[PDB]
Structure 1
Amino acid sequence: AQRVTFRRRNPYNTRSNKIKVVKTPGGILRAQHVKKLATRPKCGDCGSALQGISTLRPRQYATVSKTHKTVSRAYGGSRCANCVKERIIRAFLIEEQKIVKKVVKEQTEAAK
């Protein structure tokens, strides 16, 4: 048992000032300052986790290229792949029902 020193000046067991231990070449343990976790990005409609995307820190997204923060189709880096499917056919069916109300209103004004 060797005992380990915080390398940073914060002594406390905060959310951030976290400690993973790692053994080294030179034969003395030291502490190693892990940083906080990522989170899955989420669905603006579903509230669900969405795939293909790298869970990265928010400024850390600026380093990676377009692919890792994206998928190919429309609504790529924001949506579920099922919430898109729901809203698209919503937009199609009620677009058709606009024509339904068109034929209704032209029918009754033709009657008038």
Structure 2
Amino acid sequence: SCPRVQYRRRMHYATRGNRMKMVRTPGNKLVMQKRAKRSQGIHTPWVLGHKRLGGTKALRHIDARLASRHEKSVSRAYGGVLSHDQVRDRVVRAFLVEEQRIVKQALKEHS
């Protein structure tokens, strides 16, 4: 005597975008409600490792469009794009590479 359900929208195929959950209504009826698709979330660039970024939430389309900017970025430079270790690496790389270039140029000028 267990209840059996039917698709309530006009798509009757069990694809990844049409996943359903079983909901008991206040009228004591068992119905199928559509699961919203989820986003994987904001990641670092694929070539750098493709890891999720701390302080950034996983929002999909409309949710991302309506959410405040803080939910998707941090106050640090390149916030929402690069991680703290990546930002530190680029800062150190910037300073040290230019310093080495200056020393080489001054050496050639001295000669």
1:4 aligns with 2:21: no
Gaps of 5+ in 1: none
User: Is the 2:78–2:87 Cα contact (8 Å) retained in structure 1?
Assistant: yes
Percentage of pairs with the same residue: 41
Secondary structure in 1 matching 2:56: coil
Q: Which runs of 4+ in 1 moved over 6 A?
A: none
Alignment partner, residue 21 of structure 1: 22
Alignment partner, residue 87 of structure 2: 84
Alignment partner, residue 71 of structure 1: 74
Alignment partner, residue 36 of structure 2: 35
User: Is the 2:5–2:31 Cα contact (8 Å) retained in structure 1?
Assistant: yes
CA shift at 1:78, angstroms?
A: 0.8
Q: Which has the higher helix share?
A: 2
2-structure distance, mates of 1:67, 1:40:
14
CA shift at 1:6, angstroms?
A: 0.9
CA shift at 1:60, angstroms?
A: 2.5
Number of aligned pairs?
108
Q: What are the Cα deviations for residues 58-110 of structure 1, in whole angstroms up to 9, with x where unaligned?
A: 342110112111111111111111111111100110011111112211122xx
The higher radius of gyration belongs to: 1
Return the TM-score normalized by structure 2.
0.89
Output the amino acid matched with 2:42.
P
Q: What is the aligned-residue RMSD (CA, Å)?
A: 1.2
1:60 aligns with 2:60: no
2-structure distance, mates of 1:35, 1:6:
15
Output the amino acid matched with 1:10.
M
